[PDB]
Design a protein around this ligand. Structure first.
Ligand SMILES: [Rb+]
Ligand SMILES: [Rb+]
Ligand SMILES: [Rb+]
Lengths: 93, 93, 93, 93
């Protein structure tokens, strides 16, 4: 509950940072930058977007190292502390 | 057993949702949409397919966050509660 | 030791299967098919190669679900039961 | 502390190796090679860069298997032994 709340907030802030950075330095629209930030930190990494500037590459290196742990923490607690009880609730006779 | 059964079903439903969504909104064939849904949620993310519409990008953000935990749960219990005993069975003298 | 040995063998067989499949059905050279099989099951997924046939897409769906757990098992025990002691050995005064 | 210190050093050395290898054999600039090494070992795998030579493909296979465990170890202990207390410190009334 409180754990999930913190991780949601932390995830939102990280994604806001990426949205601002990539829309500014890499010139992406502020939906494409959000989309790209999510595709990056979840490691899906389609490559339809990727940094073309050296500033962007360096930021992306740091963004990945800092952001992956947080994003996957959130995914983990979202699945465990929100999705897992909910699926069980849909089971009990 | 019962755990694996639930996770298979949950995984199938998630993949059906993606198949329907991406075939409709992104115009993919209903084998390409399934393939793309799997490549996305397993985070392989080749990028031979990716959403081109804003609707598709927004759905993909949510689809990844909701679906990755479930898909990797299934992969985990498939490997542990199905593959792991099977490999041991092929070992015992 | 015995654990790592089994996982290496299991990983090799999975990669041989992919090498054979993608060189045959997708027409890749039998170094490109191995390379592509590894890039797939480790989820790096560059997309410089990807299946173009429906046979290839369907196999890839199944290959990912079956193979990821095994490959990451091996990576995990390679890091823990081989790399982790080795790094400690290079430490003790 | 000491754990994180070792993993940072180990991660740096692995990334230096990739930077040297891909700048030499694949002809990348020594910022693009670092960027590509990071995108590879974190499994983001955009594919804006990828090995074009057989030497590069073979090295990449081995680099991924050896490097992923270490890089994700570092990410894990960076998130747990550095980020996790820091976020808690910003919480206590
Ligand atoms: Rb990935
Ligand atoms: Rb990827
Ligand atoms: Rb990719």
């Amino acid at each position: 509950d409180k754990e999930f709340q913190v991780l949601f907030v932390l995830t939102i802030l990280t994604l806001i940072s990426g949205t601002i950075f990539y829309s500014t330095v890499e010139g992406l629209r502020p939906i494409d930058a959000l989309y790209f930030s999510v595709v990056t930190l979840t490691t899906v990494g389609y490559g339809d977007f990727s940094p073309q500037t050296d500033f962007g590459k360096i930021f992306t290196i740091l963004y990945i190292f800092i952001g992956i742990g947080l994003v996957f923490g959130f995914i983990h607690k979202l699945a465990v502390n929100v999705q897992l009880p909910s699926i069980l609730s849909n089971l009990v006779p």
